[PDB]
Amino acid sequence: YPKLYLDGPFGEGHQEWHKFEVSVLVGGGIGVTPFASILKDLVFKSSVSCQVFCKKIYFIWVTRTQRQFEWLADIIREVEENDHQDLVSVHIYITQLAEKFDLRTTMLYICERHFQKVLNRSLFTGLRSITHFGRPPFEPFFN
């Protein structure tokens, strides 16, 4: 493999969710890539530390289709497998119209609602998280 030139972190990574006991992390479109690292760091922090002020994390992923972000499904799978304190609750919202579904979206739909799970995990992805189809109800969820 060729060698890379790396310019260090420019993020200036506010971690304000640690300031709150309960936090809701909302990701949309391409603005969901950092949440993989965020969730992995959160689950590691809650695994190594006991009295973490952040008692519960809600990760609301909102996307049209999971194309180019299928790796995020595996990352969420490993995060929920390593979530030994039920810190992270993941909710995926596929907002694609039913007529414009691709093969992956239809497979997700049928495995979520037209096919029984095995260990409460969908046969397609393997996530204990529930995947929804439509606009996420932010107001009723917050209520």
Binding site: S89, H91, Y93, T95, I130, H132, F133, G134, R135, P136, P137, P140, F141, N143
Partner: peptide
């Protein structure tokens, strides 16, 4: 309980 139900 959580009311997670898409429109």
């Amino acid at each position: 309980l959580l009311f997670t139900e898409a429109h």
